[PDB]
């Protein structure tokens, strides 16, 4: 038969804030840096 039908790997670290995945612990951390850092998404205040 056919199972998985995929050839990439495993991505346990799946960010929720936006919905990103990774294959390492750090990869996720560094990624989260963006969300935390209020630069792109933010209220209307200058
Ligand atoms: Zn994310």
Swiss-Prot record:
Q: What is this protein called?
A: Zinc finger protein with KRAB and SCAN domains 5
Q: Where in the cell is it found?
A: Nucleus
Q: Which domain of life is it from?
A: Eukaryota
**Member of which family?**
Belongs to the krueppel C2H2-type zinc-finger protein family.
Q: Which organism is it from?
A: Homo sapiens (Human)
Q: What does this protein do, in the record's words?
A: May be involved in transcriptional regulation.
Relative to the complete UniProt sequence, the shown stretch is 425 to 457 of 839
Q: What lineage does UniProt assign to this protein's organism? A: Eukaryota, Metazoa, Chordata, Craniata, Vertebrata
Zinc-finger ranges (C2H2-type): 13-35
